[PDB]
Ligand binder design. Structure first.
Ligand SMILES: O=C1CCN(c2cccc(F)n2)CC1
Ligand SMILES: [Mg+2]
Ligand SMILES: [Zn+2]
Length: 313
C-alpha cells in the first residue's frame, strides 16, 4: 500500500499540463498511467497487482498500427487525467475510476480502419454491430480483459457500483465514435445557452462525459505544434492505407484518405479544426472552465496550419 510511483522531476511537473507528451520510451507508459490513477483516484482505487496485469493485457491487445496504438491509448488517458485534476470536485469516485480505464481501453484491437471501411469491406464486425462498429468492439474487448482470471480491477466494488462503472465505461467508449459527437455537442450547446444544463441530471452528465471523451480522443490537436505536426503524419499514414484498401474494393476514397492528394491535407486540417476541434474544446470550456488551455492550444495549432497554407512553413 505504501508503494508510490514517482516520475523524474521534468515528468512529475509536465504530466500535470494538458499539452504533456508521454515520450518515446514505451516501457515508462504503464508507470505513467499508474501514477495518474494514483493521483486522480487514490493508491487504494485498484489492487496494484491486478491493475498491472490489466494494463499489460490491454497493451497486448493494441496492434502495431501507425496511430490507433498503445501510445494513443495512454495519450488519451493522460488528457482525461488533466481534465479530472483541473475539475477536482465535479466528478464522483466511480467516474474517476471508470474514465481513465475507459480512455486506456477506448481503441482496443483497432485495425487502423474506419467504421465506413468495415461496412464497405463487409467485415463480420459490421454484421455484429451496425453502428459505432469499432466502438462496440472496443467495449467488448474491455469486458473480455476484465473477465480474465486476476484482471478484475473492480472486484472490491459492490454489485451496483460494478454495474454503474461498466455503464460509465460503455457510454464513454461509444461516445468516441466521432459520428455521434456532432449531435452530442449541438445538444450540449443548446443546454448551456438556454441554461437548462444540470450536472445532477444523469442524461446531462452522460452528454458532458461524451464531450470529454471526444476532447481527450482528439487531444493530438492540443499539443505544442511539433508534436501536433508529427502526430498528423501517423494519423494520415492510417488514412492513406485505408484509401489504398478503398481503391482495392474499386471505390475512390475521400480526398483525406487518398495519398495522391497530400497537397489538400493543410486545407483538410483547417476544415477539421473549424468543423470539429474548435467547437469541441469551446463547448467543453463553457461547461468546464479550467479546460481552457485545450481550446487555446487548439487555436494555436489552427494558426500553424494557416501558416502551412500561406507557404510560411
Ligand atoms: O477530417 C479529419 C482530419 C484528420 N482527422 C484528425 C483526427 C484527430 C486529430 C487530427 F489531427 N486529425 C480525422 C478526420
Ligand atoms: Mg476510436
Ligand atoms: Zn481514439
Amino acid at each position: 500500500g505504501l508503494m508510490q510511483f514517482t516520475l523524474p522531476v521534468r515528468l512529475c511537473k509536465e504530466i500535470e499540463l494538458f499539452h504533456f507528451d508521454i515520450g518515446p520510451f514505451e516501457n515508462m507508459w504503464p508507470g505513467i498511467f499508474v501514477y495518474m490513477v494514483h493521483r486522480s483516484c487514490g493508491t487504494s482505487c485498484f489492487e496494484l497487482e491486478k491493475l498491472c496485469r490489466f494494463i499489460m493485457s490491454v497493451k497486448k491487445n493494441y496492434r502495431r498500427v501507425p496511430y490507433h496504438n498503445w501510445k494513443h491509448a495512454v495519450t488519451v488517458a493522460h488528457c482525461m487525467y488533466a481534465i479530472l485534476q483541473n475539475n477536482h470536485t465535479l466528478f464522483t469516485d466511480l467516474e474517476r475510476k471508470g474514465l481513465l480505464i475507459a480512455c486506456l481501453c477506448h481503441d482496443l484491437d483497432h485495425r487502423g480502419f474506419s467504421n465506413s471501411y468495415l461496412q464497405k469491406f463487409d467485415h463480420p464486425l459490421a454484421a455484429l454491430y451496425s453502428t459505432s462498429t469499432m466502438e462496440q468492439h472496443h467495449f467488448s474487448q474491455t469486458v473480455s480483459i476484465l473477465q480474465l482470471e486476476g484482471h478484475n480491477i473492480f472486484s472490491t466494488l459492490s454489485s451496483s457500483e460494478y454495474e454503474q462503472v461498466l455503464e460509465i465505461i460503455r457510454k464513454a467508449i461509444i461516445a468516441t465514435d466521432l459520428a455521434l459527437y456532432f449531435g452530442n455537442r449541438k445538444q450540449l450547446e443548446e443546454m448551456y445557452q438556454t441554461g437548462s444544463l444540470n450536472l445532477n441530471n444523469q442524461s446531462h452528465r452522460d452528454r458532458v462525459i461524451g464531450l470529454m471523451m471526444t476532447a481527450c480522443d482528439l487531444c493530438s490537436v492540443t499539443k505544442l505544434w511539433p508534436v501536433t505536426k508529427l502526430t498528423a503524419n501517423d494519423i494520415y499514414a492510417e488514412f492513406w492505407a485505408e484509401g489504398d484498401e478503398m481503391k482495392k474494393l474499386g471505390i475512390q476514397p475521400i480526398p483525406m484518405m487518398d495519398r495522391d492528394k497530400k497537397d489538400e491535407v493543410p486545407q483538410g486540417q483547417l476544415g477539421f479544426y473549424n468543423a470539429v476541434a474548435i467547437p469541441c474544446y469551446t463547448t467543453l470550456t463553457q461547461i468546464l472552465p479550467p479546460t481552457e488551455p485545450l481550446l487555446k492550444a487548439c487555436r494555436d495549432n489552427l494558426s500553424q496550419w494557416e501558416k502551412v497554407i500561406r507557404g510560411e512553413e
